[PDB]
Design a protein around this ligand. Structure first.
Ligand SMILES: COC(=O)[C@@H]1c2cc3c(c(O)c2[C@@H](O[C@H]2C[C@H](O)[C@@H](O)[C@H](C)O2)C[C@]1(C)O)C(=O)c1c(O)cc2c(c1C3=O)O[C@H]1C[C@H](N(C)C)[C@H](O)[C@]2(C)O1
Ligand SMILES: O=C(O)CCC(=O)C(=O)O
Ligand SMILES: [Fe+3]
Length: 256
């Protein structure tokens, strides 16, 4: 439906995020859920966290080891929506499998507000787009996301040491309204790289399971952030990548 798709993009451009219900059907939810759980149970995951507690555990570049996650990353529906919203052809940069859950010694904590854009090591970072796919039901108390509508239109934050920093530092910004978006299993959000967003702690006893996939302009090139763990891209060859090197081929596949 063209009109519907144009209305969706209109919302995207105004707010910097959009909620799309039922982008996966129930069988797809169960497939991708099963694999997400398999990967978190058997592959190596990264802890994002601190002495305050775990923000999440995640499987980095989950699409390189799992053909199933690669199909979720390049899912035709998600991909057609992404390109229509971004307005130009795209490539996958990465997909991560995300987990917030409470453990005995380690209570889930919120994902603090942040600005993803310049934490992405590519030339078109400022216009990147993220698809966050719910694989279980994510009501507010399970740690759904909150967005600041229109925040993608603000001047970028003053360049700190942290490329993801500077949410709620622009003039007037703290006075902007904030939108909390619970999601059902198989819904996704798309959000712009400059859109400020957060997520709650998971205060329930059922894990929050989702994937987050970053999409970039089809012509993007490597741009180091300065942070080693963001800049060190696996499956890109023996040697470190050089600034301005194209991100092409099967490693960074065309969505189309
Ligand atoms: C120097 O920062 C750190 O060592 C920690 C840390 C780490 C991150 C981030 C951090 O804020 C922090 C640090 O950030 C704050 C967190 C707390 O509010 C406070 O306890 C602490 C002093 O400072 C903590 C720590 C141990 O130093 C991120 O914010 C971050 C991010 O916003 C986005 C990403 C981030 C991060 C962080 O990794 O990493 C990857 C994976 C993500 N996935 C799972 C959605 C994203 O793709 C992405 C772009 O890349
Ligand atoms: O899932 C979360 O808690 C945060 C996700 C996020 O910051 C992102 O996907 O850009
Ligand atoms: Fe983010």
């Amino acid at each position: 439906d063209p009109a519907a798709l144009e209305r969706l993009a209109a919302r995207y451009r105004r707010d910097g995020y959009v909620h799309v219900p039922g982008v996966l059907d129930a069988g797809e939810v169960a497939e991708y859920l099963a694999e997400a759980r398999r990967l978190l149970a058997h592959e190596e995951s990264v802890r994002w966290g601190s002495g305050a507690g775990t923000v999440m555990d995640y499987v980095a570049d989950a699409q390189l080891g799992s053909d199933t996650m690669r199909r979720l990353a390049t899912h035709p529906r998600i991909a057609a929506l992404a390109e229509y919203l971004a307005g130009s052809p795209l490539r996958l940069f990465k997909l991560e499998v995300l987990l917030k859950e409470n453990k005995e010694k380690d209570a889930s904590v919120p994902t603090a507000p942040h600005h993803d854009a310049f934490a992405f090591p590519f030339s078109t970072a400022g216009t990147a787009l993220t698809a966050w796919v719910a694989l279980v039901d994510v009501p507010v108390e399970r740690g759904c996301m909150t967005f600041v509508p229109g925040s993608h239109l603000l001047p970028d934050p003053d360049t700190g040491d942290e490329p993801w920093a500077g949410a709620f530092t622009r003039p007037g910004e703290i006075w902007m309204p904030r939108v909390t978006v619970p999601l059902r299993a198989g819904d996704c959000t798309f959000h712009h790289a400059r859109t400020v967003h957060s997520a709650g702690a998971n205060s329930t006893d059922e894990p929050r399971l989702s994937t987050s996939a970053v999409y970039m302009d089809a012509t993007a090139a490597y741009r180091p952030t300065g942070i080693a763990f963001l800049d060190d891209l696996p499956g890109t060859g023996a040697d470190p990548l050089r600034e301005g090197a194209p991100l092409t081929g099967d490693r960074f596949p065309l969505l189309r």
